Amino acid sequence: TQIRMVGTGSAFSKKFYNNSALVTFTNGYNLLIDCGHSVPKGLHDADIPLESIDGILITHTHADHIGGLEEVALYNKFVLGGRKIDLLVPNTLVESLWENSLKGGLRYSDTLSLSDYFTVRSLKTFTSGAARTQLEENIAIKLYPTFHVSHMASYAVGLEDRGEDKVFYSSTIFDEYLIDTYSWVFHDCQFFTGGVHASLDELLNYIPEEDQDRVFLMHYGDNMEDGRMRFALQGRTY
Amino acid sequence: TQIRMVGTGSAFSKKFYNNSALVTFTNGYNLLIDCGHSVPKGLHDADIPLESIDGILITHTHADHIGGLEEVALYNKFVLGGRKIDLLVPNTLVESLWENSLKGGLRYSDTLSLSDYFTVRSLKTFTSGAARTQLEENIAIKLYPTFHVSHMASYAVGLEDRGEDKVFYSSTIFDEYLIDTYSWVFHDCQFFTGGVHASLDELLNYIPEEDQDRVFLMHYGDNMEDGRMRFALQGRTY
Ligand SMILES: [Zn+2]
Ligand SMILES: [Zn+2]
Ligand SMILES: [Zn+2]
Ligand SMILES: [Zn+2]
């Protein structure tokens, strides 16, 4: 079980791609978390063919995480002979994904629903706590509803491979009640206080406890020229 | 009056940016045609600061031409002290731009309408022919409704500087009835017959007339390793 950060920058970064995770499990299952407009290019830069993708997980209904979904359905239905793959989407983000964010239909293959391009795996969610959803024989996913922008639902995902909790992926603002009960933690990081992201200073305000060895930062601004926490390096495996 | 192609690739290209034109007129007016998700990065690569942008023209309500509009409003309202600039939008693409394509509101500066981030210049259009709309003392724009995808309106733009027709920008499928009554013509080009783009072979089917000196190709696929018509070179001025 190893992870590869396809992109690491924020929504408006120009040096790094859209923050997306490329997780490959012990049973050969390759999972991608979020697929923005520049994520398929980040996959083409990392020299991983898109034919190896088995499932895609979605935590946003915004451009930087769903931008490349139309391109993925383009590649699968046209070149790959309509290979319908997994689109792991939480239940509350299903109707908001197709009818709204994808204009109720794709551009090049106009009208059809989302079930024609992907095998929609509606994951279970609610608002007062976490939620577990099994996928394969040893692929489990814990979903935590994170607060990003008002009147919109974002989610954090945890991954369990054959029982053991492997990595906690936040995909979120500075949430006071964390769980890091996980081996590794990748957390959204910002360089300016306020807004709709967890800032670096807010992370250092909750840091004297030596859990810093586990924390990894991501989803940051473009001016990057940079305490025990190590940033997620784009193009670095495991 | 010179043009600079910021990006030249199609929606799914990875080597070139989103097809966008950077036009600077004789009166110092700098105009950008279409602003997709990778266009602000294409501006950062071309070493043109975004503070010099005077107006933005929109011919699509799709991701590859409106993706970067939220980033432009981000830069202007936050860093530039709320410098409201020109957003040249045809009349029929106004209500479809804000309520639908921009989720009825931006992410980082949540609720407000489009008039708070830009000075909406509603351009005049109709479906049976071209339409002229004056902007400044010597900035005129001719809008031709092009057919892209069904049940959606796209537009081609022509630019007249102090009277003379300078360039015809198609931004479209293979339209049989063209006007090239213009000095220069930039046309969408595709490498595969069918779809919703004008293909290269369809252009060569309408080519024995020696008007090829005027035609320039753009908005093409990524496999580019390539009759008198010359392709638009990314990063080439005038
Ligand atoms: Zn993100
Ligand atoms: Zn987010
Ligand atoms: Zn285009
Ligand atoms: Zn188009």
Numbering used by the authors:
A (entry chain A), B (entry chain A): 6 to 116, 120 to 179, 181 to 189, 193 to 238, 244 to 255
Quote the study's own text:
The cyclic oligonucleotide-based antiphage signalling system (CBASS) and the pyrimidine cyclase system for antiphage resistance (Pycsar) are antiphage defence systems in diverse bacteria that use cyclic nucleotide signals to induce cell death and prevent viral propagation. Here we show that phages encode anti-CBASS (Acb) and anti-Pycsar (Apyc) proteins that counteract defence by specifically degrading cyclic nucleotide signals that activate host immunity. Using a biochemical screen of 57 phages in Escherichia coli and Bacillus subtilis, we discover Acb1 from phage T4 and Apyc1 from phage SBSphiJ as founding members of distinct families of immune evasion proteins. We confirmed the critical role for Apyc1 metal-coordinating residues and identified E74 and Y112 from the opposing protomer as further catalytic residues required for cCMP hydrolysis and release of the reaction product 5′-CMP. Together, these findings demonstrate that Acb1 and Apyc1 constitute separate families of immune evasion proteins and explain the distinct reaction mechanisms that degrade CBASS or Pycsar cyclic nucleotide signals.
To compare mechanisms of anti-CBASS and anti-Pycsar evasion, we determined the crystal structure of Apyc1 from the phage Bsp38 (2.7 Å) as well as structures of Paenibacillus Apyc1 proteins (1.5 Å and 1.8 Å). Structures of Apyc1 reveal a metal-dependent cyclic NMP phosphodiesterase that uses relaxed specificity to target Pycsar cyclic pyrimidine mononucleotide signals. Structural comparison of Apyc1 and B. subtilis YhfI also reveals that Apyc1 enzymes contain an extended loop that reaches into the nucleotide-binding pocket, potentially enabling stable binding of smaller cyclic pyrimidine substrates. Recombinant protein produced from gene 147 rapidly degrades the Pycsar signals cCMP and cUMP, and we named this anti-Pycsar protein Apyc1 (European Nucleotide Archive genome accession number ERS1981056). SBSphiJ Apyc1 efficiently hydrolyses a wide range of cyclic mononucleotides, exhibiting an atypically relaxed nucleobase specificity that enables targeting of cyclic pyrimidine signals used in Pycsar immunity. By contrast, the closely related B. subtilis enzymes YhfI (GenBank accession number NP_388905.1) and MBL phosphodiesterase (GenBank accession number WP_013351727.1) exhibited a strong preference for cAMP/cGMP over cCMP/cUMP cleavage, confirming that relaxed nucleotide specificity and Pycsar signal degradation are unique to Apyc1 and not general features of MBL phosphodiesterase enzymes.
